[PDB]
Design an enzyme around this catalytic site. Structure first.
Site, PDB file in Angstrom:
ATOM      1  N   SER B 153      63.791  20.479  39.119  1.00 31.51           N
ATOM      2  CA  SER B 153      63.500  21.770  39.714  1.00 31.51           C
ATOM      3  C   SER B 153      64.095  22.906  38.890  1.00 31.51           C
ATOM      4  O   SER B 153      65.158  22.775  38.283  1.00 31.51           O
ATOM      5  CB  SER B 153      64.032  21.840  41.136  1.00 31.51           C
ATOM      6  N   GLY B 154      63.391  24.035  38.887  1.00 35.88           N
ATOM      7  CA  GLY B 154      63.654  25.137  37.982  1.00 35.88           C
ATOM      8  C   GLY B 154      63.176  24.945  36.564  1.00 35.88           C
ATOM      9  O   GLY B 154      63.457  25.796  35.717  1.00 35.88           O
ATOM     10  N   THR B 158      55.754  25.172  38.741  1.00 35.06           N
ATOM     11  CA  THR B 158      54.881  26.086  39.461  1.00 35.06           C
ATOM     12  C   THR B 158      54.268  27.133  38.544  1.00 35.06           C
ATOM     13  O   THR B 158      53.061  27.372  38.591  1.00 35.06           O
ATOM     14  CB  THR B 158      55.658  26.753  40.590  1.00 35.06           C
ATOM     15  N   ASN B 198      70.656  22.120  42.754  1.00 34.09           N
ATOM     16  CA  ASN B 198      69.652  23.175  42.673  1.00 34.09           C
ATOM     17  C   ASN B 198      69.489  23.902  43.994  1.00 34.09           C
ATOM     18  O   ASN B 198      69.772  23.366  45.064  1.00 34.09           O
ATOM     19  CB  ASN B 198      68.296  22.618  42.248  1.00 34.09           C
ATOM     20  N   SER B 201      64.878  23.364  45.531  1.00 32.30           N
ATOM     21  CA  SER B 201      64.285  22.115  45.098  1.00 32.30           C
ATOM     22  C   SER B 201      63.055  21.830  45.941  1.00 32.30           C
ATOM     23  O   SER B 201      63.076  21.996  47.158  1.00 32.30           O
ATOM     24  CB  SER B 201      65.295  20.988  45.230  1.00 32.30           C
ATOM     25  N   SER B 202      61.977  21.399  45.295  1.00 29.97           N
ATOM     26  CA  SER B 202      60.790  20.948  46.008  1.00 29.97           C
ATOM     27  C   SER B 202      60.901  19.473  46.340  1.00 29.97           C
ATOM     28  O   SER B 202      61.173  18.653  45.462  1.00 29.97           O
ATOM     29  CB  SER B 202      59.523  21.195  45.192  1.00 29.97           C
ATOM     30  N   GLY B 424      60.502  15.145  39.021  1.00 29.54           N
ATOM     31  CA  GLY B 424      60.850  14.157  38.026  1.00 29.54           C
ATOM     32  C   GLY B 424      61.919  13.174  38.457  1.00 29.54           C
ATOM     33  O   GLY B 424      62.562  13.309  39.493  1.00 29.54           O
ATOM     34  N   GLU B 426      65.490  11.480  38.535  1.00 29.72           N
ATOM     35  CA  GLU B 426      66.624  12.308  38.924  1.00 29.72           C
ATOM     36  C   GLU B 426      67.870  11.439  39.042  1.00 29.72           C
ATOM     37  O   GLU B 426      67.792  10.300  39.507  1.00 29.72           O
ATOM     38  CB  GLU B 426      66.345  13.042  40.233  1.00 29.72           C
TER      39      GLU B 426
HETATM   40  N1  LIG Z   1      56.887  30.017  31.158  1.00 30.45           N
HETATM   41  C1  LIG Z   1      57.745  30.694  31.923  1.00 30.45           C
HETATM   42  N2  LIG Z   1      57.750  32.040  31.852  1.00 30.45           N
HETATM   43  C2  LIG Z   1      58.607  32.721  32.616  1.00 30.45           C
HETATM   44  N3  LIG Z   1      59.507  32.258  33.484  1.00 30.45           N
HETATM   45  C3  LIG Z   1      59.478  30.921  33.538  1.00 30.45           C
HETATM   46  C4  LIG Z   1      58.651  30.084  32.810  1.00 30.45           C
HETATM   47  N4  LIG Z   1      58.899  28.758  33.123  1.00 30.45           N
HETATM   48  C5  LIG Z   1      59.861  28.822  34.010  1.00 30.45           C
HETATM   49  N5  LIG Z   1      60.234  30.097  34.337  1.00 30.45           N
HETATM   50  C6  LIG Z   1      61.309  30.460  35.259  1.00 30.45           C
HETATM   51  O1  LIG Z   1      61.432  29.456  36.242  1.00 30.45           O
HETATM   52  C7  LIG Z   1      62.150  30.012  37.363  1.00 30.45           C
HETATM   53  C8  LIG Z   1      61.669  29.418  38.663  1.00 30.45           C
HETATM   54  O2  LIG Z   1      60.236  29.417  38.691  1.00 30.45           O
HETATM   55  P1  LIG Z   1      59.420  29.073  40.004  1.00 30.45           P
HETATM   56  O3  LIG Z   1      58.032  29.713  39.937  1.00 30.45           O
HETATM   57  O4  LIG Z   1      60.145  29.550  41.202  1.00 30.45           O
HETATM   58  O5  LIG Z   1      59.108  27.530  40.087  1.00 30.45           O
HETATM   59  P2  LIG Z   1      60.216  26.451  39.981  1.00 30.45           P
HETATM   60  O6  LIG Z   1      61.398  26.879  40.780  1.00 30.45           O
HETATM   61  O7  LIG Z   1      60.626  26.233  38.500  1.00 30.45           O
HETATM   62  N6  LIG Z   1      59.593  25.045  40.639  1.00 30.45           N
HETATM   63  P3  LIG Z   1      60.754  23.832  40.532  1.00 30.45           P
HETATM   64  O8  LIG Z   1      60.700  23.210  39.180  1.00 30.45           O
HETATM   65  O9  LIG Z   1      60.516  22.725  41.632  1.00 30.45           O
HETATM   66  O10 LIG Z   1      62.164  24.494  40.740  1.00 30.45           O
HETATM   67  C9  LIG Z   1      62.021  31.534  37.257  1.00 30.45           C
HETATM   68  O11 LIG Z   1      63.294  32.143  37.070  1.00 30.45           O
HETATM   69  C10 LIG Z   1      61.106  31.751  36.043  1.00 30.45           C
HETATM   70  O12 LIG Z   1      61.521  32.881  35.284  1.00 30.45           O
HETATM   71 MG   LIG Z   2      60.222  26.322  42.353  1.00 29.50          MG
END
Ligand SMILES: Nc1ncnc2c1ncn2[C@@H]1O[C@H](COP(=O)(O)OP(=O)(O)NP(=O)(O)O)[C@@H](O)[C@H]1O
Ligand SMILES: [Mg+2]
Ligand SMILES: Nc1ncnc2c1ncn2[C@@H]1O[C@H](COP(=O)(O)OP(=O)(O)O)[C@@H](O)[C@H]1O
Ligand SMILES: [Mg+2]
Ligand SMILES: [Mg+2]
Lengths: 372, 734, 7, 139
Positions: B153-154, B158, B198, B201-202, B424, B426
């Site tokens: 996650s992070g 998404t 995290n 987390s999804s 993924g 973990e």
């Molecule tokens: N290609 C990208 N461009 C910009 N920011 C990104 C990119 N990839 C990841 N991020 C960062 O990822 C962080 C969280 O993104 P988010 O849309 O909330 O999905 P997510 O949290 O990564 N899903 P998960 O993996 O389950 O945690 C943000 O702070 C974004 O800035």
């Molecule tokens: Mg997310």
């Protein structure tokens, strides 16, 4: 997928169902009736013989007889008829599709297990099967791994002590008293009050009285003095035709015999004493845990008060410093089936079924080494 | 040897998982003189990875590098991410993306133009480069295509999916993408948790099927969800929250509408309180609720149903406070006038006296006859928590189905491309039923990946008319058979839920008796009798038996649902519920949901993404080998690399090979002049358009290149220097 | 049974 | 070398004496060795010179008699062709590429030296007949 059939032959009720569900979905007496009169009307659908609830309904014109007497099977053709009726008519499921689990009382002739396997494999072609002690399954049903079981249906009464899932063969007691052969006594004491029940249909009518109106006295002597002095204990029951019969001390006096088998001229003492004299054959380190759990099972233990009579006199026999606890859930009439339903659904148990490969290799002798 | 004065090697160091080393003079057929990046003597144990020739490094796809190993890969990813500032990278079919935490130009419409039309050879990798293969395969065949996303996650699963579909929207032209991107606030709120490593987390797999009409303009979408982690609703390990919606709701409780609910503060309720940590860092729960409601309104759930939903969740919390007093070990009762039950039965419009009866008692029906009987305080608490898990899962499925109703669309759907977000592999110090199930699902997806990549290699080999047998299959079916085959870990866990006086001690002992030496992949942790070890594809992971019998028990006594269904106070509650299934354990419900996921994907030819998250305090566009080595292992890329170094990693179109190699030195003559130059013969192969090599032949080919070119230069220069000096001589004669 | 009891 | 050879070679050596003391510098030794048909590398020249230091290479002066054993020791096409064929299969070499390799690989030479020797040997396409240039520089 495929789910075990779970069957308890008993005497009186047969009760069967698929493993992994809450209660059996066929229950009916293990009774076979043949008609004895000359049938006059022509073109009637008249039939060789009836089984189960049919023979109960037609019983006026039938000789009822039971193929199981004191947990021994005494007829084999009628027993085949009853199993055949169970699988095809009651469950409407072929045996080939399902492995089968069969229930038995301990300490009874090995020819019985041999024959019962030989039948299940040869006539039905049941793909796998197993034969299990009733008392063992009552603990699965009641949620315990330790306890002394008292189980009584028709026919056989027996105690099995179990401690952390080890059996204790030398401590097993078996007693032929219970359930059927209360009723043969109750017919005689009713004859004392001027009612006479002779045929097997009348025996079924007595059995229905016994189920309805008998109860166990906390003190037998005070309650006989009371009912001798008073009518207050007296209840009346309506025979099928609409006569009414009134029964007095006879109602508590019948189930007293489980505590004093001298009433029917057996030698051995009642269930309280054989339960205690079973505990006495266990090693001293476990007796506290056997006294702490007593499980009562099967229909003959249903009579109102039987648990509380039992606790009172075991507490008299047992040393003074301990809990005696009697554990007798309302469901107990089915506990042997419920525990079989748990047991056949376990994964570990999937490696223990006798399979046709082995029976074909070994003959029916295999049942003794593979099963208990 | 391949070790010479000139060769370079990698050696380990604690501060960064690898360091480069030059080699002072050759290993001879000991211990090595080395110098670094300025002194070393370095123990060989009775040899270090040989660094690739630096002419290869820095590039789109890692598989091409002549020597494939972990420090070379981590080197490429460092150089191109930090210095070149390219995030996307390729490993076979796998796309790889490093989260920058920073915005970039690469997602723009001009780039959409740039990729659209291109094939995988044509360009540098970008997420649109996969999205355009999915679109090309869907044009080639009716066959659907899927895109599968993974990481911690992070890692940005998404955002990667978001742009992945924005590419469809821009190529095809349906105001789906606005709706899909407006769905996310609520599915975060109901679906995500705080976890030890995290926030947000999804805890579930989410599949968006983008459907196309014959013209491949977009119709709409259908949404599904799998693998929802039910046990979290009732139980948290230390430093975890319950699903966010509970805490958003509790923070709101002072607000006018929610006054009815009598909600406490966030640690008033037994289900919220256990985790220890009410306050997520730096976030307004009170605002986040409002953005949740706003997005729910934007997808057109009425403001009536939103107050239904919050009633039900206040119900689940007030239910949690119900407390049982035992009046035997066998039996218990609710002490009368119990305010939690009073408020629960008011909130959900049922008789107090019936919930009071049915919580404490369970009912059994024979075909003719039926018994009420009591249950112990443990069975009571189990049945209450199982009822909360059942209500919550049905509410999630219902908000899923309403979001479907507003996404899902009127024109019927010719064919579709599908996008899957899934967690993924973990690890933490402490691994528990949740992590066990997550890692099992990841083992099962990794099977599909391994088999698909194997098969699409094998068919390329057949296209070259190369003999098949050289390809080798890396099988992980033996581990899945450990987890899920009968007499497997999930199987003996579903058994121990039946067994009387079942316990995590007796469960562990059953495990050991079953597997401990009968299998190579199961191991017992040396110092403990409460834990066990699985060899997973990536890792060895230690699980504690302490949790599983708490969490795995689901059963619902039908009488409790048939109480709730009667309730007339508001439609939503009997609208939710819709008898074999009520007996299934959480493990078995998960094992089933996973099979639906497999039957969805196995139908469909995948393309993959892996996302990695290079630092844990989330600083922008900065990178750590500590973090990335772990995440690159978790994503399975480091197995892929090795399985591709096994086989024939390197492949060459004949004339372009000869184009350089004549400088040392068409297809048959060049094959023969190679074979006279070198005994590669077993390590090289031939086909319709290419020679293939095994690893490290390409380096040897450059080593012979340098040997010749240097020797030549020494002769050429001394020759021309012959006139150079003769020139100064003829000058001097003058 | 076979000896003692009747069955 | 015989007396006649020694006399012609000594005369040539004396032509390199730019100071009048009958000596040349070490750095002219190469001109005399190469002018007499040898093609030694800078490494070979330094070896026969004794790996001299900058200072003695630039200011120590030697007469013909000390130079002579080194010239003798140094003194005692298909490789040349393959060496040129490295940068080729129609028998040509880009003029840009030959210039680049001569100024960037090996014992790199200056651009002016390469321009002087390469003048007139590359054609309009910017291709060098390397067999002809080689024959020219071997003549
Ligand atoms: N290609 C990208 N461009 C910009 N920011 C990104 C990119 N990839 C990841 N991020 C960062 O990822 C962080 C969280 O993104 P988010 O849309 O909330 O999905 P997510 O949290 O990564 N899903 P998960 O993996 O389950 O945690 C943000 O702070 C974004 O800035
Ligand atoms: Mg997310
Ligand atoms: N409610 C009851 N009260 C007293 N006796 C009963 C009751 N129900 C059944 N019985 C008697 O118990 C016997 C049946 O017991 P059961 O456990 O069904 O036998 P089995 O174990 O052979 O099936 C019969 O004699 C029946 O009359
Ligand atoms: Mg019985
Ligand atoms: Mg985020």
């Amino acid at each position: 997928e495929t789910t075990a059939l779970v069957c308890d032959n008993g005497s009186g009720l047969v009760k069967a169902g698929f493993a992994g569900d809450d209660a059996p979905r066929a229950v009916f007496p293990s009774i076979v009736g043949r008609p004895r009169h000359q049938g006059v009307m022509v073109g009637m659908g008249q039939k060789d013989s009836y089984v189960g609830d049919e023979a109960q309904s037609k019983r006026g014109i039938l000789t009822l007889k039971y193929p199981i007497e004191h947990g021994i099977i005494t007829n084999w053709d009628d027993m085949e008829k009853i199993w055949h009726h169970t699988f095809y008519n009651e469950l409407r499921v072929a045996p080939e599709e399902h492995p089968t689990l069969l229930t038995e009382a301990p300490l009874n002739p090995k020819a019985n297990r041999e024959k019962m396997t030989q039948i299940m494999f040869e006539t039905f072609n049941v793909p796998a099967m197993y034969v299990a002690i009733q008392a063992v399954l009552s603990l699965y049903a009641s949620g315990r791994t330790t306890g002394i079981v008292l189980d009584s249906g028709d026919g056989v009464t027996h105690n099995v002590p179990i401690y952390e899932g080890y059996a204790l063969p030398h401590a097993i007691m078996r007693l032929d008293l219970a359930g059927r052969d209360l009723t043969d006594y109750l017919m005689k004491i009713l004859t004392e009050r001027g009612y006479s029940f002779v045929t097997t249909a009348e025996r079924e009518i007595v059995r229905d009285i016994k189920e309805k109106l008998c109860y166990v006295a906390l003190d037998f002597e005070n309650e006989m003095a009371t009912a001798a002095s008073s009518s207050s204990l007296e209840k009346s029951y309506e025979l099928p035709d609409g006569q009414v019969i009134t029964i007095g001390n006879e109602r508590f006096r019948c189930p007293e015999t489980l505590f004093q088998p001298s009433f029917i001229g057996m030698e051995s003492a009642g269930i309280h004493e054989t339960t205690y004299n079973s505990i006495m054959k266990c090693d001293i380190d476990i007796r506290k845990d056997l006294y702490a759990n007593n499980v009562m099972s099967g229909g003959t233990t249903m009579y109102p008060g039987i648990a509380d009579r039992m606790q009172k006199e075991i507490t008299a026999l047992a040393p003074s410093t301990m809990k005696i606890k009697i554990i007798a859930p309302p469901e107990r009439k089915y506990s042997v089936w419920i525990g079989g339903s748990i047991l056949a659904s376990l994964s570990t148990f999937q490696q223990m079924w006798i399979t046709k490969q082995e029976y074909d290799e070994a003959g029916p002798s295999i049942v003794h080494r593979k099963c208990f | 040897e391949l070790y010479t004065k000139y060769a370079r090697v990698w050696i380990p160091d604690p501060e960064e998982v690898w360091k480069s080393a030059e080699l002072l003079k050759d290993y001879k057929p000991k211990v090595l003189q080395l110098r670094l990046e300025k002194d070393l003597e370095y123990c060989l144990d009775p040899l270090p990875p040989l660094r690739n020739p630096d002419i290869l490094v820095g590039e789109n796809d890692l598989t091409a590098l002549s020597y494939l190993h972990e420090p070379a890969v981590l080197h490429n990813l460092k150089v191109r991410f930090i210095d070149s500032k390219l995030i996307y990278t390729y490993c076979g079919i796998v796309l790889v993306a490093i989260n920058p935490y920073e915005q970039l130009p690469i997602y723009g419409e001009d780039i959409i133009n740039a990729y659209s039309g291109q094939n995988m050879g044509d360009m540098d990798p970008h997420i649109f480069a996969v999205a355009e293969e999915a679109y090309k395969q869907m044009a080639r065949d009716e066959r659907n295509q899927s895109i599968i996303v993974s990481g911690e996650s992070g890692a940005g699963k998404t955002v990667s999916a978001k742009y992945a579909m924005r590419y469809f929207a821009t190529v095809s032209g349906a105001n789906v993408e606005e709706k899909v991107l407006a769905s996310n606030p609520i599915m975060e709120s109901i679906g995500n948790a705080k976890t030890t490593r995290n926030d947000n987390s999804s805890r579930f797999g989410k599949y968006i099927e983008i459907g196309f009409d014959k013209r491949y303009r977009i119709i709409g979408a259908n949404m599904r969800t799998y693998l929802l982690e039910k046990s979290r609703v009732v139980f948290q390990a230390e430093e975890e929250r319950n699903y966010h919606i509970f805490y958003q709701l509790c923070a709101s409780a002072a607000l006018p509408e929610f006054k009815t609910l009598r909600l406490g503060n966030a640690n008033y309720f037994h289900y919220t309180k256990q985790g220890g940590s009410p306050v997520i860092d730096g976030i307004d729960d009170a605002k986040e609720m409002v953005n949740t409601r706003q997005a729910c309104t934007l997808l057109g759930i009425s403001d009536s149903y939103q107050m239904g939903i919050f009633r039900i969740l206040a119900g689940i919390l007030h239910l949690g406070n119900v407390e049982f007093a035992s009046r035997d070990s066998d039996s218990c009762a609710i002490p009368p006038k119990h305010d939690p039950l009073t408020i629960f039965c008011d909130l959900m419009g049922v008789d107090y006296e019936e919930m009071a009866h049915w919580l404490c008692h369970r009912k059994l029906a024979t075909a003719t006859e039926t018994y009420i009987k009591p249950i112990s305080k443990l069975h009571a608490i189990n049945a209450r928590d199982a009822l909360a898990k059942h209500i919550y899962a049905n509410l999630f499925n219902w908000i899923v189905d309403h979001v479907n109703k507003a996404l899902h669309s009127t024109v019927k759907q010719h064919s579709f491309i599908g996008v899957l977000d899934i967690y993924g592999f973990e690890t933490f110090e402490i691994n528990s039923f949740e992590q066990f199930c997550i890692n099992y699902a990841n083992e099962k997806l990794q099977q599909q990946f391994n088999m698909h990549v194997f098969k699409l290699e094998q068919e390329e080999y057949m296209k070259e008319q190369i003999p098949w047998t050289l390809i080798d299959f890396y099988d992980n079916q033996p581990c899945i058979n450990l987890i899920e085959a009968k007499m497997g870990v999930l199987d003996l866990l579903d058994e121990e839920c039946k067994m009387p006086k079942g316990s995590d001690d007796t469960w562990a002992q059953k495990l050991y008796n079953t597997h401990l030496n009968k299998c190579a992949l199961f191991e017992k942790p040396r110092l403990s009798n409460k834990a066990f070890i699985i060899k997973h594809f990536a890792d060895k992971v230690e699980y504690q038996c302490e949790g599983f019998l708490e969490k795995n028990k689901d059963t619902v006594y039908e009488e409790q649902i048939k109480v709730l269904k009667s309730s007339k106070k508001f439609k939503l509650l009997p609208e939710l519920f819709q008898s074999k299934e009520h007996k299934k354990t959480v493990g078995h419900q998960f094992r089933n949901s996973l099979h639906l996921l497999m039957e969805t994907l196995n139908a469909t030819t995948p393309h993959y993404v892996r996302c990695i998250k290079p630092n844990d305090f989330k600083f922008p566009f900065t990178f750590d080998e500590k973090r990335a080595v772990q995440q690159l292992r978790a994503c399975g890329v480091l197995e892929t690399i090795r399985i591709s170094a096994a086989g024939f990693p390197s492949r060459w179109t004949y004339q372009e090979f000869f184009s350089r190699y004549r400088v040392l030195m068409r297809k048959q003559t060049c094959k023969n002049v190679l074979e006279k130059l070198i005994l590669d013969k077993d390590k090289y192969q031939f086909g319709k358009t290419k020679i293939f090599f095994r690893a490290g032949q390409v380096a040897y080919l450059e080593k012979i290149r340098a040997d010749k070119l240097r020797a030549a230069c020494i002769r050429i220069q001394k020759t021309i220097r012959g006139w150079l000096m003769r020139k100064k001589y003829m000058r001097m004669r003058r | 049974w076979x000896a003692x009891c009747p069955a | 070398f015989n007396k006649d050879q020694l006399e012609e070679f000594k005369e040539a050596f004396e032509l390199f004496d730019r100071v009048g003391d009958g000596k040349i510098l070490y750095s002219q030794c190469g001109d005399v060795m190469r002018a007499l048909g040898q093609n030694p590398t800078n490494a070979e020249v330094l070896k026969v010179l004794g790996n001299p230091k900058s200072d003695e290479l630039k200011s120590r002066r030697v007469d013909f008699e000390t130079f002579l054993p080194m010239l003798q020791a140094v003194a005692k096409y298909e490789d040349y062709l393959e060496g040129f064929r490295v940068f080729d299969g129609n028998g040509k070499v880009m003029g840009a590429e030959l210039r680049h390799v001569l100024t960037t690989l090996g014992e790199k030479m200056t651009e002016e030296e390469v321009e002087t020797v390469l003048a007139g040997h590359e054609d309009s396409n910017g291709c060098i007949n390397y067999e002809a240039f080689l024959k020219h520089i071997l003549s």
